[PDB]
Every structure is written in C-alpha cells, then in structure tokens.
Copies of this chain bind each other. A is one copy, B any other.
Amino acid sequence: CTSILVGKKASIDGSTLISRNDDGHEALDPQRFVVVNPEDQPRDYTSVISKVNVKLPDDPQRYTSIPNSILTNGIWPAAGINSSNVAMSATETITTNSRVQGLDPFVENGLGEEDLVTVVLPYVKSAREGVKRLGSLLEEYGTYEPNGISFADNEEVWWLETIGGHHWAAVRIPDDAYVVAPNRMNIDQFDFDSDDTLCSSDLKDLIDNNNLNPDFENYNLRHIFGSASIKDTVYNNPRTWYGQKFFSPDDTADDPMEQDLPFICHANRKISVEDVKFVLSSHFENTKYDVYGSGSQSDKTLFRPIGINRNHNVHILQIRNNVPTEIAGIHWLAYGANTFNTVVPFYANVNDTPVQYKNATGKFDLNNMYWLSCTTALLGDTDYDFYVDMRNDYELDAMSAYRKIQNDTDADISGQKDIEKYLENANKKLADVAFEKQNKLLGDMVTTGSNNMKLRYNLND
C-alpha cells in the first residue's frame, strides 16, 4: 500500500484528504463499494482470520466502505466516511523490529486490517476520537499485524501506527503539511509533551526501561520501533522519495534509497485531488527506475512502484469545507491498477451505491467497473507507450466530466427535501459516465491495438 495525507491548509480547496492504494497479495481480488446502514452493522463482531470477538456499541453510524466481494478471509472494508463526516483508512502495512517484538509480541487472536474500519469508524465523531478508540481496541484486544491507519474530519488529519501486539502512537498532521507513506514505519521525531501527539500511556517507559532507543538524544519512533533495512531501500523509501520530489522538489535530494526522509513535509504549492491520484498512480516516471521507461532491465525492476498490478482499489477520502455538511464528505474511488483508471468523486451521504461499483462478484463481468478497469490496465501494460496518449486524454476528459457533475450538484443542494435521494442520483450520473468513459477507452485501445498486433500482415497500398 501507499498512503498520502493532506492537511486542510495544504489542499487547493481547504479540504482534508486521506488516501491509500489498497494493494493485496494477488493481482486481482474483486472489490465492492458499499454503504453499511446502521441496521446491518454487527453488534457482536467476530473476525474470520483471527476469530477475535468484539462487542460493539448499539448506536453505529452509517458509513461508506470497500468490502471484498469474496468473503473467504472476512470483510476487509478498507476505508470509508461516516455520517459525522469522519474518514478512516486502514491499513498501511508497516514494519517493526525484533527488540520491540521480543517485549510485546503479536497477538494471534487480535485485531487486523480485516477488521479495523468496521470496529472503529461507525462509533466516532472526530478524527481524534477515531485515534483514541483504535488505540483502546489495540490495548484491549491486541493485534497480529504492524499497521498504519489514517483518520480525518473537516479540521484534522491523524496518522496512527501500531507497535507490537498492543502499543501504538499517533500524530496530528499539521494543517499546512502532507505525508507520503509506504510499507515502512513512518513516524519520526516524536514529542511526548505535544498536544498534537497521542500514544500508549506506557510507551515512553517501554522505551526508556528496556534500552530500546538507539539515539543519543530525543525520540524517533521509527528508529526505535521500526526498520531501516536493505529491503526498505528498494521497497519503501523510493516511493516516499518520488512523492516528496513531486511535492517538495527543492527540499528533496536525489537519493531514492534515503532512510531518513522526513515524515511530515511541506509542499511548494497547494495539493489537488488530481495531484494525489498522480502520485498514487506513479511508476517513477522520468527516472531510470520506471518499468515502462528507458532504463536497464535491472534498474527498471529495482524499485516497487506506487501504481501497481495489485492496486485493488484506490480511495481518496475528502472532507470539504467549502460546502454545507450534507455534501462535505466525498469518497473518491477507483479499481484496478491505477495506470488506466480515474477516481470518481462519490458523495458519501447516501444510503446505497451505484450498480457498476457495488456489484462485483467472483465471476468475470465487464459490465462491472472492477473487472473492466483491471482489463484496461492489463492491456495498457502490454505496450504502455502505445496506449499512454489515449490514457492521458481519457483522464482529462473523465475528470472534467466528474467535476462538472459535482459542480452542478453542489450548486443546487439548497432546498433539496430528500438529500440522500438527490445525491444517489448524482452518484448514479457519476458512475454512469465513469463506466461509459472507461469502456470507450478500452474500446479505443482494442481498436488501435488490434491494428498493431504481432499476428498481422498488411499490404501497404
């Protein structure tokens, strides 16, 4: 996974943004876009992987989610926005080390990424409440994974990292800052006296009493609890670097392998949703590390890209401030490898979701946006330079169309007597256009690509 966080003074529109590529192990695994209404939310939750049992409050809020179609390993809701306009994305798999694992081992029947959104998001009314509730659950039930989790509301953005079986720490991202986070523990310098941090009450004592701190001065949490491995230099650090080079070119050096890139960054400009999707779709464009580029075979395959075949979904959760609260929450969503899709700005304030995004099953169905998007990206991968111009045209054309619908819908929000019905209609329009444009792109690729098949022999007359 790759995550990007943006504070409300750092965005182009004064919104908060939290985002993640939901990358799995297998390339394909069908995803659904689903609103969980309170009557359908469990009060007695049991996980599939760990068999953890959690009793949940009887007053859950409605929330958007991105559950797996195939439920063999549980729900895996990934991310969503609740009716208090709180956003949450879980998880970014991060790293740990043997010194802390030796003191606080993973808990086999604890919580995992399978579970976190389901057991946290419906029950909180701010990003800080989300952090605190998740922290409480980790302390009580434990976890069997090293994870990073983002929270946001219209004011604040937070990043929480889990540490061993029960511990955790979290930082409020400054309003004017952004973060790019790969699969490596991220939190660096950490102030135990700050109003902008939270952690296990015993965290400082854990560090101090067990000689966990490698540094002569101060506390850097990933130095203490995380990794700085050789694998980090190729799997993780280059992703951070490329994102920081894009947003902070004059503050970022030219070593993608750097182990101490800052966590919190300040861009040279305000950040758009388009900017976030670009980085989340990237493959080190204009460097020798681009698998579609001009580098040697070894350089082209050295680094894990951000856009990747096993992007199952990408979500950008936006809580806007330039609008009434009933349209503030936007669950931007796309499926499949991010090179050939576009995120669609779905209104989160709805009771149901569009058919092309809700209805994927294990059966291949090109009327569904998961399967259609995956198919497009695979074809594109076979000859990227041949298809990229069509791709670029499609991106501009589709995003323009989404924004027109959003602008029109926003403009007429006043006086609507059935808001959810009004916004469900807007989301249907968005999904319809997204499907039509995705389908037209694949058709254009198939038509032009077929002219360029190996199995051809033309008379040039």
Contacts and interface: CB of A to CB of B under 8 A. Distances in A.
Contact of A403 (B101, B233, B389): B101
A197 interface: no
Given A97-B274, A214-B271, A230-B285, 15 more contacts: A12-B213, A14-B211, A97-B396, A98-B403, A99-B272, A99-B274, A101-B403, A101-B404, A102-B404, A102-B406, A103-B403, A215-B269, A215-B270, A233-B286, A294-B302
22 contacts: A12-B211, A12-B214, A98-B396, A98-B399, A98-B402, A98-B403, A101-B403, A102-B399, A102-B400, A102-B404, A102-B407, A103-B407, A211-B322, A214-B271, A214-B272, A215-B269, A223-B269, A230-B285, A231-B388, A231-B389, A294-B296, A294-B298
Contacts of A102: 399-400, 402-404, 406-407
Nearest to A274: B98
Contacts of A322: 211
A59 interface: no
A144 to B, nearest CB: 13
Nearest to A99: B403
B400 A98 contact: yes
Interface string A211-249: 111111000000100000111010000000000000000
A262 interface: no
Contact of A392 (B229, B269, B298, B404): B229
A13 B286 CA distance: 42
Contacts of A183: none
A302 B292 CA distance: 13
Interface in A62-117: 96-99, 101-103, 105
A444 interface: no
Contacts of A406: 102
A404 B214 contact: no
Interface string A379-411: 000000000110010001001101110110000
A230 B286 contact: yes
Contacts of A330: none
Contacts of A285: 230
A230 B101 CA distance: 43
A299 interface: yes
A396 B214 CA distance: 18
Contacts of A257: 286
A231 B229 CA distance: 31
A296 to B, nearest CB: 8
A407 B209 CA distance: 13
Contact of A214 (B230, B270, B296, B299): B270
B13 A211 contact: yes
Interface in A246-289: 257, 269-272, 274, 285-286
A269 B214 contact: yes
B299 A294 contact: yes
Contacts of A97: 274, 396
Give the 3 A-B CB pairs with smallest separation, nearest first: A102-B403, A98-B399, A101-B400
A131 to B, nearest CB: 26
Contacts of A403: 98-99, 101-103
A254 to B, nearest CB: 13
A215 B271 CA distance: 9
A396 B231 CA distance: 13
A302 B280 CA distance: 24
A42 B273 CA distance: 46
Contact of A105 (B214, B229, B404): B404
A274 B407 CA distance: 50
A404 to B, nearest CB: 5
Most buried by B among A97, A99, A299, A392: A99
Nearest to A302: B294
Contacts of A296: 294
Contacts of A13: 211
